[PDB]
Design a protein around this ligand. Structure first.
Ligand code: HEM
Ligand SMILES: O=C1O[C@H]([C@@H](O)CO)C(O)=C1O
Ligand code: NA
Length: 250
């Protein structure tokens, strides 16, 4: 669980701060914060703690990973971000993509996810099929987030709140529509729509519904719906862990 973060060079650090700034401008301009978060999440979410494979190590650069069914459309984000790597080539893709996720959350008014640089680009994309299945239930969530990634139940519910940004695209996952009425605003609305039941014009996956059906997940969703501050804190925490799965372990 413990971390021993590398001190990157002053050149590297400067590249990071300059990247963050370009990312803010880009993401706000193009209104692509949700897709950037999905990029960061899918880059990180392949981690498997038993084998020490996968995780946020730049492999989404490889068109092979971009070809996984779970990752349909991330090739747009990868292309979108390439001019940032071109201006700051010292940065690793792994850092670049995780930073873009952190910036995505910030630009939409979300909490400040700390960021520690130094991730190295690994050569080997992990095996496809580790990211969650939207049709499966609470026990699948714990398989992917817990047994694989190594995150907690609280993490599962908080991270699901990321669907407060963006929407499904038929051509990408086969689902359609947003979870909230403000897909460019990072807030706790996702839990409130969930707890409100299905309604016209808003998407809920079965993976979302599994939060209202489990004794641990449901109180957490209730708590996040009532108290955006506690949602922000727990999301900040989980997103930080997610972004550093397998990285700089002590
Ligand atoms: C149970 C876990 C999850 C499932 C089953 C799931 C599934 C999906 C699916 C099917 C889409 C549709 C993509 C499309 O068609 O455009 C989507 C989009 C998205 N996912 Fe999730 N996801 C999960 C967890 C997460 C997490 C942990 C995050 C970030 C913290 C996240 C952030 C997003 C975002 C921001 C989008 C919107 C992308 C856009 O608007 O272009 N998801 N997700
Ligand atoms: O989040 C997203 O941003 C882009 C587009 O909407 C704006 O560039 C993409 O297609 C989304 O899913
Ligand atoms: Na929202």
């Amino acid at each position: 669980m413990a971390k021993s973060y590398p001190t990157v060079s002053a050149e590297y650090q400067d590249a990071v701060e300059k990247a963050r700034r370009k990312l803010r401008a880009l993401i706000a301009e193009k209104s692509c914060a949700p897709l950037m978060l999905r990029l960061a999440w899918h880059s990180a979410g392949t981690f498997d703690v038993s084998s020490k494979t996968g995780g946020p190590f730049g492999t989404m650069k490889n068109p092979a990973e971009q070809a996984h069914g779970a990752n349909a459309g991330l090739d747009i984000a990868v292309r979108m971000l390439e001019p940032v790597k071109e201006e700051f080539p010292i940065l690793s893709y792994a850092d670049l993509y995780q930073l873009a996720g952190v910036v995505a959350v910030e630009v939409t008014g979300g909490p400040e996810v700390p960021f520690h640089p130094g991730r190295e680009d690994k050569p080997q994309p992990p095996p496809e099929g580790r990211l969650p299945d939207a049709t499966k239930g609470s026990d699948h969530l714990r398989q992917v987030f817990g047994k694989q990634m190594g995150l907690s139940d609280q993490d599962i519910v908080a991270l699901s709140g990321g669907h407060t940004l963006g929407r499904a695209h038929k051509e990408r996952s086969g689902f359609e529509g947003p979870w909230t009425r403000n897909p460019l605003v990072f807030d706790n609305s996702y839990f409130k729509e969930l707890l409100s039941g299905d309604k016209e014009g808003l998407l809920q996956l079965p993976s979302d519904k599994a939060l209202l059906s489990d004794p641990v997940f449901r109180p957490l969703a209730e708590k996040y719906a009532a108290d955006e501050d506690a949602f922000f804190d727990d999301y900040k925490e989980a997103h930080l862990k997610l972004s550093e799965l397998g990285f700089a372990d002590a």
